[PDB]
Amino acid sequence: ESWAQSRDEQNLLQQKRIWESPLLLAAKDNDVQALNKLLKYEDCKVHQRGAMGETALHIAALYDNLEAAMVLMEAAPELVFEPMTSELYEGQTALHIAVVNQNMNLVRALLARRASVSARATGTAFRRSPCNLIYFGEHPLSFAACVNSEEIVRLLIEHGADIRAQDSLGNTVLHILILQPNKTFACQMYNLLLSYDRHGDHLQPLDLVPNHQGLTPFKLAGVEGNTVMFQHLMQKRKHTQWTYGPLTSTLYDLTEIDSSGDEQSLLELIITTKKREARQILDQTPVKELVSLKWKRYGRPYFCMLGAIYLLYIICFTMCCIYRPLKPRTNNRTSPRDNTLLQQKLLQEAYMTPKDDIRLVGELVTVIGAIIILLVEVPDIFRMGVTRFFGQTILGGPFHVLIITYAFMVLVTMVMRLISASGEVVPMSFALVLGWCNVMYFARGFQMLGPFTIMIQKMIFGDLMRFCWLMAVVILGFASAFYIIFQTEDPEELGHFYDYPMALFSTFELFLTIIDGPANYNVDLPFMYSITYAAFAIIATLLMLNLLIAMMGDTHWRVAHERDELWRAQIVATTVMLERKLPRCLWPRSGICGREYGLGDRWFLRVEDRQDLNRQRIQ
Amino acid sequence: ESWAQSRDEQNLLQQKRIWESPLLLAAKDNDVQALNKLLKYEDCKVHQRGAMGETALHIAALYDNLEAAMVLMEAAPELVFEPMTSELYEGQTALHIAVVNQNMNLVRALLARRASVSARATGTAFRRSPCNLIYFGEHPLSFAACVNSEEIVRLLIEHGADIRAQDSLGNTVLHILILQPNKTFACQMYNLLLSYDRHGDHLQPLDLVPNHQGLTPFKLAGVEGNTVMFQHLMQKRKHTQWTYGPLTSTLYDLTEIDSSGDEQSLLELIITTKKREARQILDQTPVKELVSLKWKRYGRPYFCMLGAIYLLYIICFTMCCIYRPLKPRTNNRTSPRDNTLLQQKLLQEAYMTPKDDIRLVGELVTVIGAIIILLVEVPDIFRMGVTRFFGQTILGGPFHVLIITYAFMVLVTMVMRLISASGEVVPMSFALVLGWCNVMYFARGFQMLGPFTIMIQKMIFGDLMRFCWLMAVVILGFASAFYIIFQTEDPEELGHFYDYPMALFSTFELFLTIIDGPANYNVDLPFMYSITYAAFAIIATLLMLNLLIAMMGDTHWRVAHERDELWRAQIVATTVMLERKLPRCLWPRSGICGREYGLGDRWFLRVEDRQDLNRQRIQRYAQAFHTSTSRSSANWERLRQGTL
Amino acid sequence: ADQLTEEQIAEFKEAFSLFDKDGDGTITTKELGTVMRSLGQNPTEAELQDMINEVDADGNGTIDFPEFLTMMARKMKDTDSEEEIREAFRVFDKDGNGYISAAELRHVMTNLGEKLTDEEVDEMIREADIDGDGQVNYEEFVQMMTAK
């Protein structure tokens, strides 16, 4: 936050140093008459600096003064070199400024003066950050390619630029064109920059070299959500086999898309990234048909076998909690005889009958099932991450947590059974509502139940969470109000408010209208009570519970095409998970191989379609 | 599924055989220089095959090489014949490929070489399936008529095509034009193909011969939902009687529309088909006025007499269940004396008083009424079908099942009364809630109650069924959680959860908030209970029951013009049913006959209307001969943003 | 006349229809006489004879639809529309009659949210409705795109 305060003080200081210098002010406006009067002096300070560590030639290039800049090059040719020496604009030469301002005469004048075309603008104002408004690169070829000047790009190559210039991020020129906000004109430059490669043998052509994250220009368009650049890069990876009237048969190349992928492949990059614009690449021409052929053939049957094994697992755990051992109460009821009702307790040496030997089989099914969960899920949490990015995979989210918390509460019950601890009701009653509500994970493979389970999640972290802050405000105010009213009275004719923990639990239920409401009709209630409960029922039942339905009803039609895009991405995340963990004896690799068809060793997927007729008479 | 895997292996193998053959590769690109070097050899394999069983002429026609194809015909004229011999593209000749690619010079070159214009492309890649992207037919005239080339159709007729070519489905040329996805240009070809008939005496003109389902081209447009082809075929079947200013009086022909129909007539084809695009033909020019004249005149009074007979039937059955015989308890209460409350039981020799002789009349009304249901409904289930297509007639759907299940449960009660079985409460208590909720069938003849009964059905098989899978997940988790909490405690001060069948029935009701909630306020409840019930009431009452109202409210305005189209189709299904089962003494035949008016023996329906007078339209086409607002314009920018 | 797209033939087909008020495919001098009197003009009997005989290639004496289609391609005004608009219209039009309706702009607006009353749907129609039948053409649909 204080960096932007410090950056604003730098720009105001630069305007101070220009006005307080007769060279820099004269180079600022144009003052071609004034430069000849100063530069003919003896010590006219040609290597003068400023706040950004700029010279007089940096100023004349920044304010676009061709006439003043040539005078500075004639009187001092050393200023074509010597970039800015500040921390912010480090390394930026005068050639960089003339290219970004898209000047044609000043660039050609600098190239005659032997300018450096391979300098690096490696300051903190050119790096890819949310603080900077631009990410142009580091090299003059990277600057000319992003401001869309095909004249200067052709000019820089003829004077010996490098087509493989990599940044501090490792990005080449072709990576930077993808990160630009103008998608259409980036496609026009992308064809131009490959056209001047044409001799890039190198054992790496041009658009196959990755940056420091291992991403090619094809996969970087997949992560950043460039739908326009993604369709432009599909032209290289398809082959039209035959055209039979209104019927073509293309042949896409699954060598950088399919998740056979010992490297990091494109379906893992899209499904783990946080951008909501990358999930639109799951509807394009090779990827939509690839996922459906995985999900219909091998994705849905293997997901419904894991849905039936888990369902018979959580029935076997349920009947170990129903038939769990109990004995009658040992000592006495003599806990104070008006508020005790428990009459059984837990047994120690439970396994001494044949009916409990069946349950011991059922409990060993449970505990072994609780270890297998902590061996296929925990070595992905402590290994691939230190829990920095585990939370929202896509939006799928809690079912990682609910299956860990289930496997923890089973193993707490194992500890309390071996040491014969007292309360096993608490670790079980978590483990069941965590156990059965995790069956909702398996409702993502059914179109009837799929988009409804997403809307349950988008209300709990949203329109139900913001209501439960303004519910706990109300039922702290009224429950502390109802408590002091019945504090001075008889707690057996109306005992909804005798303890303060009980008065919080009555008013939580009177807000929800699930219990009735305090009324006796035999004894005179306090006169203050009927006032403060009629005040309560209006702003609980008439106002705020009818304002959830107005708010959940308003949300449900607004996010009603987002939850359908979220469901088609939950299938891709499920398919990639089932493909990774299952062995290769099951799940054959997608697409047709090309060894016995004379196409190489890569894997292809053909798609035929009927396009149009109305656009066939005229096309 | 594995067929598409096998079909993809065929196409990659075809590209292998082309590259591995010097003839087929040279015929592929164009290589007119390379063919003269190979074909001058001795054994240059002119009848060479491939994966699709194709020759070099099939390749040159497929990749559109006119120059290479003529060289193959000069060096070997036998290749104009000999179609593909694979299973997939069986029978497809080289003339077929030149027609589909819409080549004009290659077709005329093949016809000079005596090509077969009556060959059949009877492979598995041309049949009408959801697997194939096209259904063009089998004959070259069928191929040229579907790719919209009027030059090649005129060329094929002059060289002796057959205008009555029928497929393996029985479809003629005119049937195939209806099944094409471009409706407007199919109308232009339909006039052309009839124009070249003009001598089709045959005792069958041209567009009256049916396919193997008995459907003419007029009725096939009715089934497939071609609204454009349906209005085009109405031009033949109307007659303008007189035009009196802005007032014309047309005269439609009800010889293939009206369901007098000893054959299968058009109102039965539309109302039984599964397509949702065929129900738009119920709003066209003769059919909308035909249904209304049946429903207003004879459809609604006969449907409200069956609604009053059935209502007095289900009152007579109700009072036989209220006045059913019971005697006091015989032996003892001695079933374990804390959980028994029943104190009457069923009687055996019930009919021994005059008050039960009235009921015996009322029960024989019921049982005879239960046989008549199983004689007018079951001989349509076992006869017209083996229950393959009984389920969704239109969407009407369950009322077939609810009237069979009612007539079954009455006859179960007849068996249990004769053999004097114990529990008659179970077959009755089904038979009443099945009996009275079948009165909702008769709410389709009232516009107030009509479109509301459809929305009850579209929630039960939809937004209520997907909620009851995620309700049974929750009330298995919490009911098994609440059970083990109160398992170790006293089941009379709070006994909502003492059995596991009872704990499932408490938590089903606490989810619905119909019973109150476990609270005693005299004894200390478990500390785990108040945590796990406050967790429960948030995701039952605050979240998921307020998410039905947000979901049923979102659906109700989306399907709000579909349920109005579903109601106008429930009237047509009712009208055709009442017309079929009632005798001909009632229900006179619709329309005016033409015997005593000099029009033949067919039946007509006249419709007069006032059309317009739109000056700006008619003035623009006439010169061609010669020798509220503010938020509307906001909506169009919302469409311009959506289109962009 | 084999240069004409799908939507123009659907416009010209009903344009043929309101000339031909007897339910066939023949424009005699009578039916063009009934039109030109309804325009308020006095049709000269020579003028009625010329306009039929000018475009009648077969020589039967009655203008059918392919001759009315041939004439209208001569006297076509122009259209220079876009690819994105034409592909939008063919998806918007469902039954393929060449016309978007009031029943078919309800489907497009329900597709992207946008709660319209049935009155406000017809309030959208009459803005794009240049000539008037309660339907928007393809020519009127292009007009409501390139206005900005």
Ligand SMILES: CC(C)CCC[C@@H](C)[C@H]1CC[C@H]2[C@@H]3CC=C4C[C@@H](OC(=O)CCC(=O)O)CC[C@]4(C)[C@H]3CC[C@]12C
């Ligand atoms: C002794 C026998 C009965 C062992 C039975 C064990 C199974 C019932 C367990 C063991 C491993 C479990 C699986 C381990 C890993 C996962 C992935 C997990 O994925 C998520 O949570 C993704 C959602 C998110 O992104 O948060 C969902 C449950 C699932 C399929 C589990 C389903 C239930 C399984 C098959």
Ligand SMILES: CC(C)CCC[C@@H](C)[C@H]1CC[C@H]2[C@@H]3CC=C4C[C@@H](OC(=O)CCC(=O)O)CC[C@]4(C)[C@H]3CC[C@]12C
């Ligand atoms: C939106 C509101 C303003 C319109 C409807 C609300 C009224 C129906 C409520 C609001 C205040 C209520 C009153 C608040 C206080 C009392 C005292 C109350 O007295 C007792 O507590 C009974 C025993 C006793 O102390 O004598 C009897 C009901 C009464 C008159 C209530 C009757 C119902 C009233 C008028």
Ligand SMILES: CC(C)CCC[C@@H](C)[C@H]1CC[C@H]2[C@@H]3CC=C4C[C@@H](OC(=O)CCC(=O)O)CC[C@]4(C)[C@H]3CC[C@]12C
């Ligand atoms: C013994 C005396 C009192 C005479 C009683 C006769 C009526 C009460 C019953 C006998 C036969 C019944 C009919 C049998 C068959 C049908 C068709 C049935 O059709 C459907 O269910 C169509 C909707 C769907 O597709 O589900 C609707 C009820 C109806 C008219 C029934 C209405 C009530 C009827 C006329």
Ligand SMILES: CC(C)CCC[C@@H](C)[C@H]1CC[C@H]2[C@@H]3CC=C4C[C@@H](OC(=O)CCC(=O)O)CC[C@]4(C)[C@H]3CC[C@]12C
């Ligand atoms: C997302 C939630 C937190 C919405 C905010 C509402 C809270 C104000 C509610 C919800 C959960 C409630 C708690 C759930 C569990 C308990 C334990 C409960 O147990 C006891 O201490 C007494 C013993 C018994 O009740 O049997 C007392 C009420 C209390 C603190 C409740 C007080 C009111 C709470 C904090």
Ligand SMILES: CC(C)CCC[C@@H](C)[C@H]1CC[C@H]2[C@@H]3CC=C4C[C@@H](O)CC[C@]4(C)[C@H]3CC[C@]12C
């Ligand atoms: C289990 C026993 C006791 C009673 C069960 C009642 C069930 C099976 C019955 C009673 C009410 C019935 C529904 C009542 C209303 C409609 C709407 C209608 O347009 C189609 C039939 C439909 C959808 C019925 C389907 C079957 C139904 C749900």
Ligand SMILES: CC(C)CCC[C@@H](C)[C@H]1CC[C@H]2[C@@H]3CC=C4C[C@@H](O)CC[C@]4(C)[C@H]3CC[C@]12C
């Ligand atoms: C306090 C104890 C007894 C009960 C606690 C239950 C809580 C932790 C459990 C039970 C029901 C669960 C929810 C059930 C449904 C969904 C929707 C799904 O798309 C994501 C997970 C999510 C959002 C679960 C989150 C965790 C959850 C709220």
Ligand SMILES: [Ca+2]
């Ligand atoms: Ca309520």
Ligand SMILES: [Ca+2]
């Ligand atoms: Ca005429």
Ligand SMILES: [Ca+2]
């Ligand atoms: Ca003519």
Ligand SMILES: [Ca+2]
């Ligand atoms: Ca339309």
Ligand SMILES: [Ca+2]
């Ligand atoms: Ca119009």
